[PDB]
Amino acid sequence: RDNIQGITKPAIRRLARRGGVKRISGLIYEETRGVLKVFLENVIRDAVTYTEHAKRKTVTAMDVVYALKRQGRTLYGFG
Amino acid sequence: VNCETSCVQQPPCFPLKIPPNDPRIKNQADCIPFFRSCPACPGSNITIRNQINALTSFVDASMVYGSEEPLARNLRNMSNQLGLLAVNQRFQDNGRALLPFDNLHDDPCLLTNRSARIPCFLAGDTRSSEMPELTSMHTLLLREHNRLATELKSLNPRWDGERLYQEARKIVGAMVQIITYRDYLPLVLGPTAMRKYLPTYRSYNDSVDPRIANVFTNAFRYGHTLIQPFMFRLDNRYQPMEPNPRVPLSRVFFASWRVVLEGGIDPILRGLMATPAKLNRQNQIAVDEIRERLFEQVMRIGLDLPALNMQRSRDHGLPGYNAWRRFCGLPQPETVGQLGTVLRNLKLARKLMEQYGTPNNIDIWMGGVSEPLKRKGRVGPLLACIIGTQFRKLRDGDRFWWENEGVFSMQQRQALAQISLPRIICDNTGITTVSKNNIFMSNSYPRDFVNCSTLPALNLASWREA
């Protein structure tokens, strides 16, 4: 299960271009993959905790929204 | 080459020509008298024609104290050392002060009443003698200055006449600025335009140009759409005051005898406070009192105020509607459909297209007053932009702004923050029941009226010098 490589180098390059980055080093992609993995781990852990507390086997959008809001990353558009 | 009697288009006369089938003027040979504004420097073929502003652009209550040294000196009471302003030596309003009479060779005031023989009034501005509401305002401000000087003399007996005059004038100017920028402009522009064009005050830019724009003198005439066709007078119970409770506006122009011999300024102030204004609608712009019978008594023929506005805009050489929409960063319509979408009234767009032929040729006043009003506002986006820019420049570019450091002390600023036009009306008149906060919104008696004693008073103890 190696799915962190699913975030390809062109995708990271596109995300950097949206951020105004002109030139990218070759070692940036691994660092970005690690940062994304850490962020997703935290958010998903909080969402799964919220889901278990609700006695459910399905992760809903409200759980993710609450998990993001708990981290000071309020997200608008999903409830 | 007298413009008020001759219709020949010779300078400085720029008469208005009568279109065919005019409802009021049946003779095309006649015309509306009109005077071109004085050029900045006459006879110059090199400079583009520009107009002169005869008053200080700052909000410094120059309508009470004047903008020229001889007039300002003549407006004061030099018979003493209390620093008061001159008051009427012949008439009083129930024992209260009245504006001094003014001596002009051609006085329109005695033309309305040839029996009263009451001349025009003397104030900081020569237009103070139109119409009894404005005269009531001028008298109220005069009384307020006199009362402030009296209280300051009571607090500081060591101060001389010049010091009393200067301090009272400072307080009156600060009061005018506070009332204008706290009660009036939010209602004019609306919260969106107020926040966009007049942000929080920070400090004094000396780099901001405080001059009055040429377009502002024609964009601020949006108030001609708020004019009611009557003058209302109310008694102590805010009931119609007999006789003549509702007087046509054509019978009040340049009529100071109504202020003098008809009960003073208290009924006029009550009517101003307790009467709704006129809403500006795209099919109801200006009443016929100012459109057909303006200055009828004092002139050979009635004037047309909107027509005068647009003819003055043409005389001043102002750009068209599209140029000012581009100036303010707004989309500029080009066809009848785009103009209808912008104006939200398609029939008005057809009428404007028929009259002018292109949106670029629409006069600034007409396009400004034909636009839909902003939410919680009374001007269109273009007029709101112009007015907000001008007042932001007048506020940030003023060195003696009351909030600027060094002008008023912190205690003085906090004391001035407690003022209100209702309190001034309570203090300087015999009116005991007065509308609540935001006097420009309360208009129905007795739902939004309180007793005069509940209004906090201005505490001048911070002005004591020791």
């Binding site: - | 400085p12 279109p19 409802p23 004085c38 073929n45 583009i48 024609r49 107009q51 002169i52 502003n53 008053l55 200080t56 700052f58 909000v59 410094d60 309508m63 903008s67 040294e69 509401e133 305002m137 100017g173 005018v176 009332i179 209602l187 001059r211 502002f216 003198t217 708020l226 009517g271 406070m273 009467t275 709704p276 204004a277 006129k278 609608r281 109801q284 200006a286 009443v287 016929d288 047309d304 909107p306 005068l308 043409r314 005389d315 050489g317 068209g320 100036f327 009428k351 009259q355 002018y356 292109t358 040729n361 570019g397 003023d398 060195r399 036009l421 420009f440 919104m441 309360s442 208009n443």
Partner: protein, 104 residues
């Protein structure tokens, strides 16, 4: 201009210590856009008959007021959120700010 002053001058001078004539009385207006006259500098539009503005004839001001501004008085709509005090203070503030003199 005096180095120190406590109060405004009546004529409005010396308010801006860099350009003392800014905002004073008896001074020319400031133009936010270049002027648009018939001949370019002095003649207003509609002075000479037959001259068009931007390829279109200039409408008479009285005709525009007759066609658009005119409306029956009896259909006047009162303002439930404003009073005549609003309009009166507007006129008073306007007389505070500006005045364009004309020849006698």
């Amino acid at each position: 201009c005096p180095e120190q002053d406590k109060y405004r001058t009546i004529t409005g001078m010396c308010n801006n210590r860099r350009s003392p004539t800014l905002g004073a009385s008896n001074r020319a207006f400031v133009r936010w856009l270049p002027a648009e006259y018939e001949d370019g500098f002095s003649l207003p539009y509609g002075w000479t008959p037959g001259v068009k503005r931007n390829g279109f004839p200039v409408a008479l001001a009285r005709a525009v007021s007759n066609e658009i501004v005119r409306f029956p008085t009896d259909q006047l709509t009162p303002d439930q959120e404003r009073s005549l005090m609003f309009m009166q203070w507007g006129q008073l503030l306007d007389h505070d700010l500006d005045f364009t003199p004309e020849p006698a």
